[model samples]
Target: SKVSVAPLHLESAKEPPLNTYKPKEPFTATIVSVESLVGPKAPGETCHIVIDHGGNVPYWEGQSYGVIPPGENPKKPGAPQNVRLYSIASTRYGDNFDGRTGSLCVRRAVYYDPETGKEDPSKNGVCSNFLCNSKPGDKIQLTGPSGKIMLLPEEDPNATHIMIATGTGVAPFRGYLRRMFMEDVPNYRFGGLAWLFLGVANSDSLLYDEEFTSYLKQYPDNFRYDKALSREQKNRSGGKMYVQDKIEEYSDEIFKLLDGGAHIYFCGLKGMMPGIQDTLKKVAERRGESWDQKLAQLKKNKQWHVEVS
Candidate 1:
């Protein structure tokens, strides 16, 4: 075999170094890099985190990683903790994208502090956030190949992916879009449509605008991005609007997409999840379908995914 180019021979990027990251036998990683998906005016930032698996098995798109609590938590020591799950955004082949490394595109969590009437650093929460804050050379903790709310099945050769995310919930879709159009383009077997419904507080807060715009150019009619800004544009549709509001306006197409077998994913604020589901319920009701039954079927079949921080 002939090589087209000379090899750089660079090593794979690993998060949290392998040695000091001593935990049980679960998968873990360190933060390799941090990137902001949004511009200065955008709502929030999305991240690309690379966790070294140390040659563990690869993960699928829409799968997730469970973040274990930090070992040296000076604030809260000797306390049992829980894991924060982040949907995996990279494709299985993406493990090899950076010399056989695994990466995730995650969003940071910024929440208001109910106590002290001010912002709290602990409020700067999220599994990936904890991972992202680690030093470049520090070993972080994680576990899982967890959860089944994913989209990669054997028979789904042409699966249509419609991901609706508000604020930081857009993490998984970042992986979905990236895997489909970027790394696996020519060799991809799961090619289909990809549409995104993204909502934020204002127009300036719209994340990944340019990236989606560029992707839409390739997929053309197959991809679309609708943004709902709640604060700014006080009168876009007569008053304040969110993603659900815009989705209502496009209910006709929304239902069409759904009826055509689009896998719907929702994440971000826990509050928004119910609202979006309610809108669809109403729509299905008006259309003479059993909304509850249909929604249940989606859940049972895993066509619908809801993840909250």
Candidate 2:
């Protein structure tokens, strides 16, 4: 039997005015503020937004927001360049600063063409660039708290969440970690093993190092943080060490987590995704377990969450 989905009009999804720019059942929000939460070191910018709650609905933690281009502004309306994806860094609850509540730590896309000698932000990405360029009070038109990456833990509190990310990929996990550990939910204790394997070029490009280390030190039994400085570390071992290499370093613990009910999220550069995924597949294969079966189990039972964009 053929299934019929709702007819979503592109005109409705068309970009709207920047000022009166509420999406009106189509558009989602206008950027209220774009603050650089991380210093020059972090690879991304945390994009904070305030949607017209009365007009447009709010979003969940795991969801994301997409920014639409200004309509009739020389820039093409509803263009993908103007549009971008960002995870909701904040929780479902009210926001910290704004009462309306909407934000996410977006992995800023940066690209430099040696030929052009110009920063082609679009090639790098959009939403982050838009939010990054936004001023203190500048408003941006937005749409959606979209995506189904790795949903937040609802059932087994004992389930471990091992987040492995490099650079700005840490944004999503940062929010999840905050909810699980920081915000105290009544009669709710999330007991999950978290082992983070983060790879970065330099200390400047690193994200949430102090917090991850603090979590490791504070919750030695549950959370742990490991760094793979590709270029920063002085003693390089005279080899190209990446996150996959780091995985080999802690293979035992990783296998343990894999055997148990643990979630793994990958949200770094796409170049690293294949390697990491292949590494995990190889790990399962070498362990005499069905790699595809493990992958299917991971997806079906939500054992491992690998979200790469």
Candidate 3:
């Protein structure tokens, strides 16, 4: 009983505006706001930053913006610092519900000496530190609405979306939820389920909790939010609850969704992949299926999407 309304497909939708602003001639955007997403007790700082592009650079959900930190590379005497790409945390309409701005979720990066157990200020990430500490009026060099891998499958408004994220990897999924649940997009009215499994250290480390809870309350059937608080929760075996463990809990339902044309997206730490793959493989074997063939089919059908850093 599908609706007769035509859905927006990625192939037919407006081609992604890619690399409009390059490294050498990046657009200068102003910082609109910078607020910490984590509490004081959280392990590290994660900031939700909004930047005003003044409608100059248009980008869609799931794309990344390259930020050029101001400084010369110490390793290369005359070379500029390398640009860092951050996944956007807002929809195309932006956080203000206008087309003039965009948002990013950044984790302030600081390195610690594993051997000595001492803080290493010298090894801090250049771009992450700059963006996390930016003021309301600070100007930032930006480049590209880059990447197509994480784009939504607008082709099927009724398709299920299984989003798995860890730490700050929740950025793109935030944009996707904003579009599907928060905004009243004209051409697209989502008709399927959006299930999110987010893993973090504790409740205080959860990002965008208020907004997601509001969406869940407003659209219970359409939106599902699950959390795996590693430090505060435990799995069936009394181990820490990780994203994959959470997924394994819902393996049957998730596999059913995947069999029914649902798209699964994974983002965040690259280390999350191996455990996820192993879990899925185990689940598939239990169901008398070959995980490799299923994965290949999913890739061939463009049903599997991943962007991990």
Of candidate 2, the 10-residue stretch with the lowest lDDT total is 2-11
**Model 2 per-residue lDDT tens digits across residues 174-230:** 766655666555433677677778887766666666766777666788787877777
The candidate that wins on lDDT is: 3
RMSD of each: 6.1, 9.1, 3.9
Please give the ranking of all candidate structures by TM-score, highest first, separated by commas. 3, 1, 2
Off by over 4 Å in 2: 1-33, 37-56, 71-82, 94-99, 116-126, 233-239, 281-290
lDDT of 2: 0.61
Q: RMSD in Å for candidate 1, one decimal? A: 6.1
lDDT scores for all predictions?
0.63, 0.61, 0.90
Error of 2 at 202 (Å): 1.6
Tens-digit lDDT track for model 3 on 1-309? 122211233224378889999988999999999999999778999999999988788887899999999999788788887889999998877888767789999999999898997988889988998999999999999999799999988888988999999999999999999888877676778989999999999999999989888878888999999999999999877889999999999999999999988899999999999989988999899999999999999999899999997
Model 1 residue 243 CA deviation (Å) reads: 1.9
State the lDDT at 250 in candidate 3.
93
For candidate 1, report its TM-score.
0.75
TM-score of each: 0.75, 0.75, 0.94
> How many clashing residue pairs, candidate 1?
8
